[PDB]
Design an enzyme around this catalytic site. Structure first.
Site, mmCIF file in Angstrom:
data_model
loop_
_atom_site.group_PDB
_atom_site.id
_atom_site.type_symbol
_atom_site.label_atom_id
_atom_site.label_comp_id
_atom_site.label_asym_id
_atom_site.label_seq_id
_atom_site.Cartn_x
_atom_site.Cartn_y
_atom_site.Cartn_z
ATOM 1 C CB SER A 1 48.265 27.153 168.486
ATOM 2 O OG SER A 1 47.973 28.275 167.649
ATOM 3 C CE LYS B 1 51.130 28.339 165.639
ATOM 4 N NZ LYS B 1 49.697 28.097 165.343
ATOM 5 C CB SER C 1 51.321 30.558 169.502
ATOM 6 O OG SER C 1 50.407 29.513 169.227
ATOM 7 C CD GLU D 1 46.968 28.706 162.712
ATOM 8 O OE1 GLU D 1 47.255 27.964 163.683
ATOM 9 O OE2 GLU D 1 45.977 29.455 162.719
ATOM 10 C CB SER E 1 43.439 29.986 172.814
ATOM 11 O OG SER E 1 44.155 31.006 172.143
#
Ligand SMILES: [Cl-]
Length: 263
Positions: free
Chosen positions: A44, A47, A104, A140, A211
């Site tokens: 992440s 992002k 996230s 994602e 993570s």
């Protein structure tokens, strides 16, 4: 120092995994580097680059951050803490940026990606900034597979530290957009156990964690304002040999402490 290098090697050995660190100290324009040219899955932390690509686009489209984006059940992926609350309504691009950076939210990430044209467009934005290492290959949730040796969805610590410096402290973005990114990152809700856990309580941090949920991959990228000192940029990436390894945020905190001790 060789001392800091020794300490990072020892930390990595104790952890059982592979650790990547890049610190930029803007006080003296120095760097502390550990496996800083190797590739690590970003999870992440990517992002930040998607949000920054949308911010760059908004420099020439002033309505952009207010643009409404429909959220549908078909948009849900594996982790959608904010978007799940808005199904069948709309969220603005500003709201999606904050959700991606502060919670996230993986729907938010996919909407930022889609808006700018997809992973190759996020990557082309990085190239325009002078980052020739970053690659966002996938959306994602599949960008999180973190397979050892797979270059997809990876960058190096050196590159991400230099690019985060450009984004948060340099001139990659216009003044309003830079301030907006920093405000978003300072408002992160997810980072207290990572880099921040290895720094004195008084230091001010904007960070994005990541993570992957595979290979125990645990990352954090941060801009740091120590008390009465020039800012730092710190990137800490960590991944482990076992597919179901558990996350090790304490390793990022330990690295942060090692590379900042004395400051
Ligand atoms: Cl403290």
């Amino acid at each position: 120092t060789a001392d800091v290098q020794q300490k990072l090697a020892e930390l990595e050995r104790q952890s059982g995994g592979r650790l990547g660190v890049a610190l930029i100290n803007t006080a003296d324009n120095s760097q502390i580097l550990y496996r800083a040219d190797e590739r690590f899955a970003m999870c992440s932390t990517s992002k930040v680059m998607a949000a920054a690509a949308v911010l760059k686009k908004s420099e020439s489209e002033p309505n952009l951050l207010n643009q409404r984006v429909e959220i549908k059940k078909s948009d849900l992926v594996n982790y959608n803490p904010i978007a799940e609350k808005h199904v069948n309504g709309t969220m603005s691009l500003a709201e999606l940026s904050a959700a991606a950076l502060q919670y996230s939210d993986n729907v938010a990430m996919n909407k930022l990606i889609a808006h700018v044209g997809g992973p190759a467009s996020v990557t082309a934005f990085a190239r325009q900034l002078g980052d020739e290492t970053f690659r966002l290959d996938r959306t994602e949730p599949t960008l999180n597979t973190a397979i050892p040796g797979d270059p997809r969805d990876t960058t190096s610590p050196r590159a991400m530290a230099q690019t985060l410096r450009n984004l948060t402290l340099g001139k990659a973005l216009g003044d309003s957009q830079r301030a907006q990114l920093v405000t978003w990152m300072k408002g992160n809700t997810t980072g207290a156990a990572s880099i921040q856990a290895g720094l004195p309580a008084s230091w001010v941090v904007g960070d994005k964690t990541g993570s992957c949920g595979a290979y125990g991959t645990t990352n954090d990228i941060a801009v740091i304002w120590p008390k009465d000192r020039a800012p730092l940029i710190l990137v800490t990436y960590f991944t482990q040999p076992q597919p179901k390894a558990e996350s090790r945020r304490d390793v990022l905190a330990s690295a942060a402490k090692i590379v900042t001790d004395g400051l």
